[PDB]
Write a protein that binds this ligand. Structure first.
Ligand SMILES: [Ca+2]
Ligand SMILES: [Zn+2]
Ligand SMILES: [Zn+2]
Ligand SMILES: [Zn+2]
Ligand SMILES: [Zn+2]
Ligand SMILES: [Zn+2]
Length: 167
């Protein structure tokens, strides 16, 4: 079982993988922004609010995974928020609400995702390789198993198309 935000499976005992009691969402306490482990059942933000209906991500066309509410009446994947450079979290410990979506350039919405082939159905990011303009939705890149790594150089997030997967 694996955290659906960082795609890693941690046997960590303090920063554990929580399972939503209702939708079986799997996420690292620290990846989803959970202050502490509760005694009893844990519910993700989606299952706390409309447990029966699926929500849309404001930033992509995919429907599974870990969601938070935005500050403007919508929902968004934590991973989409993490990877689209203009998007923010108002609280960076609770990782919510997702905000600054209005700061995304319109250009991101005019790109075509090469994985799902859709244009205008989300905000695309692009291959980190210089002069590669191949674009993809964050969750499409994730689902397709593209290389996507987060590394702070003195946080730097780098995603690549399958041509430019790095050494
Ligand atoms: Ca709404
Ligand atoms: Zn994680
Ligand atoms: Zn849930
Ligand atoms: Zn999304
Ligand atoms: Zn896509
Ligand atoms: Zn590329």
């Amino acid at each position: 079982a694996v955290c659906c935000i960082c795609n890693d499976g941690e046997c960590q005992n303090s920063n554990v993988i929580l399972f939503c009691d209702m939708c079986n969402l799997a996420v690292h306490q620290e990846c989803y922004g959970v202050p502490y482990i509760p005694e009893g059942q844990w519910l993700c933000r989606r299952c706390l609010q409309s447990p029966s209906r699926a929500v849309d991500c404001a930033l992509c066309p995919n429907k599974g995974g870990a969601f938070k509410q935005t500050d403007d009446g919508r929902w968004a994947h934590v991973v989409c928020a993490l990877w689209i450079p203009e998007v923010c979290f108002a609280n960076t410990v609770f990782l919510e609400p997702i905000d600054s979506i209005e700061h995304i350039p319109p250009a991101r919405w005019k790109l075509t995702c090469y994985i799902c082939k859709q244009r205008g159905s989300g905000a695309c990011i692009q291959c980190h390789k210089a002069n590669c303009y191949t674009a993809f939705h964050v969750t499409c890149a994730q689902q397709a198993g593209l290389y996507m790594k987060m590394e702070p150089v003195r946080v730097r997030k780098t995603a690549y198309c399958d041509i430019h997967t790095p050494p």
